[PDB]
Design a protein around this ligand. Structure first.
Ligand SMILES: [Cl-]
Ligand SMILES: [Cl-]
Ligand SMILES: [Cl-]
Length: 130
């Protein structure tokens, strides 16, 4: 599914994302917007290294989930990558939390550095009741 902005914001808040390891809801929104355009079914194959990015946060198969087809991969979220293509984002959120438990935090996504870091991201949650 493709989330509407404010519906997503409330969904992430309910799932405990607001302020998770120092990361504001608006940062998570900006990440989702630029990774996937709020689309849970988004996939992107990286021919370069044989990995794939899955779902609303575009989480990569090399480190984070198992798709069986990425060489040398590990599965730190301990999930099938299929779990990151559901309409319900709970598993994706649990995996995103796990990504940010590592030293880089949200910096693990380059799109965040490009489109979110050091920016005014307030617009993402304006009017959403969060
Ligand atoms: Cl911030
Ligand atoms: Cl699974
Ligand atoms: Cl679903």
């Amino acid at each position: 599914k493709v989330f509407e902005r404010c519906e997503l914001a409330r969904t992430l808040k309910r799932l405990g994302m607001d302020g998770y390891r120092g990361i504001s809801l608006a940062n998570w929104m900006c990440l989702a917007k630029w990774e996937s355009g709020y689309n849970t079914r988004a996939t992107n194959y990286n021919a370069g290294d044989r990995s794939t990015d899955y779902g609303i946060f575009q989480i990569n198969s090399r480190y984070w989930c198992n798709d069986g087809k990425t060489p040398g991969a590990v599965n730190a979220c301990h999930l099938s990558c299929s779990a990151l293509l559901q309409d319900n984002i709970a598993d994706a959120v649990a995996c995103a939390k796990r990504v940010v438990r590592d030293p880089q935090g949200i910096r693990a996504w380059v799109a965040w550095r490009n489109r979110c870091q050091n920016r005014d991201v307030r617009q993402y949650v304006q009017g959403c009741g969060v």
